[PDB]
Amino acid sequence: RHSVVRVEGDRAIKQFFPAYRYNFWKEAGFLSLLQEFDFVPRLYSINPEKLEIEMEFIEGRPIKDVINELNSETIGRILDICRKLDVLGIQKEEMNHPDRHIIISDRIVFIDFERGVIKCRPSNLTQFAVYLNSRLRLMKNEELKKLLREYKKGFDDESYRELRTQILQYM
Amino acid sequence: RHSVVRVEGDRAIKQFFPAYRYNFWKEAGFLSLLQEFDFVPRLYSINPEKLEIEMEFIEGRPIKDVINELNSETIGRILDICRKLDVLGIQKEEMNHPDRHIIISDRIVFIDFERGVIKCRPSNLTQFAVYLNSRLRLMKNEELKKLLREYKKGFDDESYRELRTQILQYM
């Protein structure tokens, strides 16, 4: 609704509709701030006159196509990226509906940052954990909800490791 | 040392050395995230291959040239921008040496975001207050340090207003 992506070679061009200049800049800003990491597309150019962002085309399958086939190693890698975004202070949003926004090949790429916001304690990992439990039925809410409460309280490396192992044992 | 700025018409073009590629992305990222506000330059283009950013040239005088002539209303406007950055979670850095990075005309523009970082409680306002007191000698360190300690504890609008009025009274 906010934008259209067209693929031209190995580049994806995301053009926002004119009403959504605000989201255009958030996408450009957060992609720029995440270029030191390998879990976002490369950013090649921005054109505010056309509200166009030129970026790397990401080959692979969206998570919604493979979520039930994914092994524990791969899920752990996705949890690491959510945790990284938590630590960076970037709340990507809609991480409980990542169906079309995590692209899986030999690597894991997150796409679509146009709703990102800065926050002290982001909800990337716990939004994703709701999705993960919704698709894999790892456990009942009361157990998952307790696990998310403990991570949120501590919110350090130790709290994360406990959540990580306590999620992945279940698979 | 990180970059060279050249002015071509109404555009300032900043080119980084390759060693400072990640400062290029911070400048691009934070300028992008601040385009919804009027206190940064407009961003026009990025070129990651050349590490070049094209933005608005800002007409006006740097704060170091006018700091002792600035009235209380104008200082309050600069304090507001620091607070805004604090609230947004963006620590610009080097705000205790803003000498060439606040440009004052009819409006107030902050420039140079290449050292910015995200954090829960940024130090923009407490860094700027140290500079402000250093140039205007408004109060003794111990009093300022007491005022800054209280602002950092509360860190809400109320804490800010108390800081704001208690700074501006001295002129």
φ and ψ of B95, to 5 deg: -75, -10
Residue A137 neighbours by CB under 8 Å, 6+ apart: none
Method underlying the structure: X-ray
For the CA atoms of chain B, what is the radius of gyration? 16
Nominal resolution (angstroms): 1.9
What is the DSSP secondary-structure string of chain A?
Answer: --EEEEEETTEEEEEE-GGGHHHHHHHHHHHHHTTTSTTSPPEEEEETTTTEEEEE---SEEGGGTGGG--HHHHHHHHHHHHHHHHHTEE-S-TTS-TTTEEESSSEEE---TT-EE-SS--HHHHHHHHHHHHH--S-HHHHHHHHHHHHHH-SHHHHHHHHHHHHTT-
Write out the two tokens for A117: 């916001």
CA A88, A93, A99, A100 torsion: positive or negative? Answer: negative
Query: Where would I find the H helices in B15-169?
Result: 21-33, 72-88, 124-136, 141-154, 157-168
Bridge pairing between strands B52-56 and B11-16 = antiparallel
Q: Which domains does chain A have, with CATH numbers?
A: 3-56 (3.30.200.20), 61-168 (1.10.510)
The 3-state DSSP class for residue B45 equals: strand
Which of A115, A118, A119, A124 has the highest number of chain B CBs within 10 A, making it the mutation to test binding with B?
A118
Q: Which residues of B are annotated as a binding site?
A: 1-3, 14, 55-56, 58, 100-101, 115
Residue type, A112: D
- Chain B residues closer than 8 Å to A36 by CB: 22, 25
Of B32, B45, B47, nearest to A29 by CB-CB distance is: B32
- Chain A residues closer than 8 Å to B36 by CB: 22, 25
For the CA atoms of chain A, what is the radius of gyration? 16
What is the distance between the alpha carbons of residues A109 and A106, in angstroms, rounded to a whole number? 10
Specify whether the CB–CB gap between B71 and B38 falls below 8 A.
no
DSSP structure class, residue B65: G
Of A22, A43, A118, nearest to B118 by CB-CB distance is: A118
Beta partners for B93?
none
Write out the two tokens for B44: 């026009």
Helix H or strand E encompassing B115: none
Tally the C-alpha atoms within 13 A of residue B9's C-alpha that lie toward its C-beta: 3
Write out the two tokens for B8: 């071509």
Distance (Å) of CA B85 to CA B40, B44, B137: 11, 22, 24
What is the distance between the alpha carbons of residues B62 and A84, in angstroms, rounded to a whole number? 38
What is the distance between the alpha carbons of residues A35 and A123, in angstroms, rounded to a whole number? 21
What is the distance between the alpha carbons of residues A162 and B117, in angstroms, rounded to a whole number? 28
What is the distance between the alpha carbons of residues B168 and B151, in angstroms, rounded to a whole number? 15
Which of A33, A44, A46 has the highest number of chain B CBs within 10 A, making it the mutation to test binding with B?
A33
Write out the two tokens for B117: 């970082």
Q: Do B30 and A35 make contact, defined as CB atoms within 8 angstroms?
A: no
Cβ-based neighbour number of residue A3 at 10 Å: 17
Specify whether the CB–CB gap between B168 and B75 falls below 8 A.
yes
Of A22, A33, A45, nearest to B29 by CB-CB distance is: A33
> Chain centroid to CA A78: how far?
8
What is the distance between the alpha carbons of residues A6 and A47, in angstroms, rounded to a whole number? 15
Question: Is A55 assigned a ligand-binding role in the annotation?
Answer: yes
Residue type, A1: R
Residue B171 neighbours by CB under 8 Å, 6+ apart: B71, B72, B75, B136, B138
Residue B158 neighbours by CB under 8 Å, 6+ apart: none
Residue B155 neighbours by CB under 8 Å, 6+ apart: B86, B121
* Residue A2, burial from CB neighbour count under 10 angstroms (0-12, 13-18, 19+): middle
What is the distance between the alpha carbons of residues B99 and B168, in angstroms, rounded to a whole number? 20
What is the distance between the alpha carbons of residues A98 and A112, in angstroms, rounded to a whole number? 10
φ and ψ of B8, to 5 deg: -125, 95
Beta partners for A117?
A91
Q: Do B29 and A26 make contact, defined as CB atoms within 8 angstroms?
A: no
Specify whether the CB–CB gap between B51 and B5 falls below 8 A.
no
